[PDB]
């Protein structure tokens, strides 16, 4: 572009210890930069997904054969000095110790952080970690097609005690006109809602599906498909007319308290972002004019990265690095994300506890081999217990005799003996309540102290609310 040469001139004049945030081809940019600074110089481009990295690598090396390209998504390439543009995943650099990471990173003339607003745990750990030696680097953070008009509608919520005299129909809890004979996509938060509403519509005599098997439903017009946010990912919908968005989604959230377990994580129904709402609206108005029905639900500005930030903490354990502190410090300089001061503060107090002692070898092994979805839970809980507990699964609102078993845990069942967990799941907490049991209290100085520190921090916030 006429504006790409501007960005490039600005990037290429950058001095070590400088940072630039860019909004906009976020990959012809590094190409322009390397062509400007010298093809035998080294430039790194960090991509969230390994697949995305390999895909760009392939595309670029074929499109620009005179510029050297490298791909780092596998094992640590020792003594790496590859001269072209290196396309790597944030996870690739997560294998090296801080000193190794720094030694590797300073050898690059430029470091491009692509798709930073994905805020993945590997991304959040790398950004906080490299920021620790940002004085030695030149880093650029980069971030982010309707062709027909979309008729925008606000659908009212259905109340228990409904009539809709065949003029309207209840679809995902929203009042939609029956006339809407058109090709429909219904956005829903949970997996269960997508199936429950699909069977209700088929019972009403509509060609309904849920998310190939859909390909079958999709062939006959008109069609109604009730799909989760995971639906956009790949899946093609032929000549889609109308989108009905519930405005909701299901994501991992965290709750922090001075009472143990200080950390409790679990899926939660939340509002989608402006961004996610735009992606949902964006499914129509591409080939033909669209219709978008949204709930009265107001969207959130930014994604909640607190859960990923907690998961990211795993990447500083071996190095004795407080990822939460590094995130906070990086974000103060780079201003990439919105901040919840109380939450960062609490996460940081807990992070200090996490790295307060060397992790037992036994726990290190399990975390390395388990298919457990949150191995950091094991690291946090080891400050109180070394034996993982199996809490009975919760189907509906009742305690079942079903248990979730992951590899290498060597766990015991809950029974009636509640473990002194520092970190628990929403459901582990619910099972405790339903069974009429109680969570133990901090059993050591470090744990007692983290609790006091958390209490103190909450005290201010609460008072700041009061007036």
From Swiss-Prot:
Please list the residues annotated as glycosylated.
322, 405
Q: Where is this site: Cleavage?
A: 460-461
Q: Which residues form the Helicase ATP-binding domain?
A: 11-155
User: Motif DEAH box, which positions?
Assistant: 114-117
Catalytic activities = Leu is conserved at position P1 for all four cleavage sites. Alanine is found at position P1' of the NS4A-NS4B cleavage site, whereas serine is found at position P1' of the NS3-NS4A, NS4B-NS5A and NS5A-NS5B cleavage sites; a ribonucleoside 5'-triphosphate + H2O = a ribonucleoside 5'-diphosphate + phosphate + H(+); ATP + H2O = ADP + phosphate + H(+)
The source's domain of life comes to Viruses
Domain named Helicase C-terminal: which ranges?
173-367
* Localization in the cell: Host cytoplasm
Task performed by this protein: Multifunctional protein that contains an N-terminal protease and a C-terminal helicase, playing essential roles in viral polyprotein processing and viral genome replication. The chymotrypsin-like serine protease activity utilizes NS4A as an essential cofactor and catalyzes the cleavage of the polyprotein leading to the release of NS4A, NS4B, NS5A, and NS5B. Plays a role in the inhibition of host NF-kappa-B activation by interacting with and inhibiting host TRAF6. Interacts with NS5B to enhance RNA-dependent RNA polymerase activity.
Assembly and partners are described as: Interacts with host TRAF6; this interaction inhibits host NF-kappa-B pathway. Interacts with NS5B; this interaction enhances RNA-dependent RNA polymerase activity. Interacts with protein NS4A.
Q: What name appears for this protein in its UniProt entry?
A: Serine protease NS3
Q: Which organism is it from?
A: Classical swine fever virus (strain Alfort/Tuebingen) (CSFV)
Full-sequence portion shown in this chain: 1792 to 2279 of 3898
